[PDB]
Design a protein around this ligand. Structure first.
Ligand SMILES: [Cl-]
Lengths: 386, 289
């Protein structure tokens, strides 16, 4: 799960991490009041959407007086913000962050993230703040420090000195940044994060370091023990159908294609999408449903799959191991009751009582249910119906 | 066979839970030597005719088991792996899905230091055909034969096993290595075991998108494994940057993609299968009719 810039920064403040003063605004009047309350003579007015690239998209404007705050907030709040990261449809802006303007002299890249191959944490830093870190790594590797942090020891001064070298920081500047990085590492660990990205991290003319932006991603498996992170969720930023499926115990991902699939187990579900492609059609979705799911759950899975009116065939591919295929077949028949659908359903059930299951489906005399037992035959039947 | 057999003594962590009870009973009926289990505050009881203990340490002292089968909920997995390692368990098979990655990261470092190997988490376990099973796999699919199986998935493993049995062969041992970003034993360690196992003549490896274990395995196979290897890598059609059910099944960069893995395996001489329907057929090509 991802959170907004303003939410990351409130976490930072709650953990003693230096941050520019700022506050979220849900209306134009709230934006103006926030600027008044913050003081100074410069305020950034920022669209709050999860997607990056808000500046180029026109979602960040720097106001020099309270009329500009009012004007900018009116233009940004309610806009459809298009960035490179939103894609062309853009995203409706429903909240602003109002932040005091800093006197920026340097911008850096800083991220903390999981290194899967080494089973440890990486701290990535670059002198090239604001830029695309993948392009900087490819083109100019000497402007990047990639520092491997063994979690047994955690982040140490010696790791920091490597970051400070690549950022060209002097002794005292280095010490101040390294102190901030130690707090960010501790937060990353404490909140079960899997990505903390600050692009850019600014150094002010007064010698302070702040995150000008912040993108935090949290391990979905650990949200149960961080209720203060879970409550930050913004469902307008998440896919409604994926979320709805997950409420019913289903994992669903929408693709563009003509053959829907319903499968038990993520590996077999991916393999099912793969065989549809190999057969010369296109998978319309990933869906993992338990073979033991209730007919109610199966009925919800049918509902979700059939929303896509480009689908020409449903391929049910279920391996009943511990769960008997004959009971899966009965549940599919129950789940199709009172449904009005003109597309064929290929049902490949294999494993325990596979033969009985096929007998049950054949005996229903519902001729647009087409039972198969072997995977190869299943996929060939799907292909003939497309 | 590798790692486990009909004599291996096994304790169950989370023994009295409902699911664990169901599977433990099926494992015992299949031939697994389950000698006991753990549930805090139920020490001294009896369950499925075996002793219950409060702690792994009490169970290991009474039974001398050095293999554990772990069914505890996701919030308990890390601490249960650490407990097993602390007590002298040598192999922990961890079924449960949705373990926080960080918990697994720390638990594995401790297991490594104590010399405990892990299978899983987020896996169906390990089975030695017609001898023993530790986990949730359907025993009867696994008919004894000369084909080893290593898989990051559950049901797709059964599909592969079934194709091999239908194609006139069978399985020596099948290991589900897990669908999480951090797992225990994987392709290199298990391929080495299978290479030393005289009953195994060929190995099927089943992978998926995410990380690069299957790329690294390719060179390793060329250099160390002379038994034939068949590979199927799920997720050729997966979109980039999207989790496909399993926490580990996400393409973050090009070398984590199914195409990158298949291409590496192919170039090092592995028998790579494009269609998941044709794994059994590949084994028939290799071994004969
Ligand atoms: Cl799976």
């Amino acid at each position: 799960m991802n959170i907004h810039e303003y939410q990351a920064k409130a976490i930072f403040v709650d953990n003693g991490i230096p941050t520019l003063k700022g506050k979220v605004a849900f209306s134009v009047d709230e934006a103006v009041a926030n600027a008044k309350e913050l003081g100074g003579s410069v305020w950034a007015v920022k669209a709050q959407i999860h997607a990056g690239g808000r500046g180029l998209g026109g979602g960040v404007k720097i106001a020099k007086n309270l009329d500009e705050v009012k004007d900018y907030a009116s233009k940004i709040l309610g806009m459809n913000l298009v960035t490179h990261q939103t894609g062309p449809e853009g995203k409706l802006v429903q909240k602003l962050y109002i932040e005091s303007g800093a006197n920026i002299v340097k911008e850096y890249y800083l991220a903390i993230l999981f290194n899967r191959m080494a089973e440890q944490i990486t701290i990535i830093a670059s002198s090239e703040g604001g830029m695309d870190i993948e392009k900087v790594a490819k083109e100019s590797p000497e402007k990047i420090a990639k520092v491997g942090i063994d979690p047994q020891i955690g982040f140490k001064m010696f790791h920091g000195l490597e970051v400070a070298r690549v950022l060209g920081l002097d002794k005292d500047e280095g010490k101040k940044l390294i102190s901030m990085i130690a707090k960010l590492y501790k937060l990353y660990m404490d909140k079960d994060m899997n990505m903390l990205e600050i692009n850019p991290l600014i150094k002010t003319a007064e010698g302070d370091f702040y995150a000008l932006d912040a993108k935090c991603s949290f391990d979905d498996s650990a949200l149960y023990r961080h209720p203060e992170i879970a409550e930050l969720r913004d469902t307008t930023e998440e896919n409604p159908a994926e979320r709805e499926a997950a409420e019913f115990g289903l994992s669903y991902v929408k693709l563009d294609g003509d053959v829907a699939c319903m499968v038990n187990g993520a590996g077999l579900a991916m393999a099912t999408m793969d065989i549809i492609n190999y057969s010369g059609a296109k998978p319309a979705n990933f869906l993992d449903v338990g073979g033991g799911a209730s007919p109610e759950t199966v009925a919800k899975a049918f509902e979700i799959i059939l929303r896509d009116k480009n689908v020409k065939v449903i391929f049910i591919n279920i391996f009943g191991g511990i769960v008997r295929c004959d009971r899966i077949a009965n549940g599919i028949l129950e789940a199709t009751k009172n449904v009005e659908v003109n597309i064929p359903i290929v049902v490949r059930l294999d494993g325990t009582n596979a033969a009985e299951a096929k007998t049950i489906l054949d005996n229903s005399n519902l001729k647009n249910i087409k039972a198969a037992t072997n995977l190869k035959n299943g996929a060939e039947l799907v292909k003939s119906l497309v | 066979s590798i790692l486990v057999n009909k004599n291996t003594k096994v304790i169950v962590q989370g023994f009295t839970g409902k699911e664990a009870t169901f599977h433990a009973e099926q494992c015992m009926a299949y031939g697994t030597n389950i000698v006991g289990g753990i549930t805090p505050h139920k020490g001294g009881q009896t369950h499925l005719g075996k002793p219950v203990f409060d702690t792994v340490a009490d169970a290991v002292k009474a039974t001398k088991a050095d293999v554990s089968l772990i069914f505890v909920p996701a919030f308990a997995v890390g601490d249960s792996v650490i407990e097993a390692a602390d007590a002298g368990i040598k192999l922990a098979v961890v079924i449960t899905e949705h373990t926080p990655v960080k918990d697994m990261m720390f638990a594995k470092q401790y297991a490594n230091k104590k010399g405990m190997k892990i299978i899983g988490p987020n896996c169906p376990g390990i089975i030695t055909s017609e001898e023993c099973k530790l986990g949730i796999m359907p025993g009867f699919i696994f008919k004894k034969g000369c084909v080893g199986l290593i898989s990051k998935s559950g049901t797709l493993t059964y599909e592969a096993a079934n194709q091999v049995v239908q194609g006139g062969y069978g399985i020596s041992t099948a290991v589900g290595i897990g669908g999480d970003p951090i797992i225990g034993l994987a392709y290199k360690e298990l391929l080495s075991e299978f290479q030393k196992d005289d009953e195994t003549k060929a190995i099927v490896m089943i992978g998926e998108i995410g990380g690069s274990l299957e790329v690294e395995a390719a060179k390793f196979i060329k250099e160390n494994i002379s038994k034939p290897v068949v590979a199927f890598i799920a997720g050729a059609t997966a979109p980039k940057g999207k989790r496909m059910g399993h926490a580990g099944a996400i393409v973050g960069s090009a070398d984590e993609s199914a195409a990158a893995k298949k291409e590496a395996l192919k170039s090092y001489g592995i028998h790579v299968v494009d269609s998941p329907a044709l794994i059994g057929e590949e084994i028939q090509k290799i071994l004969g009719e």
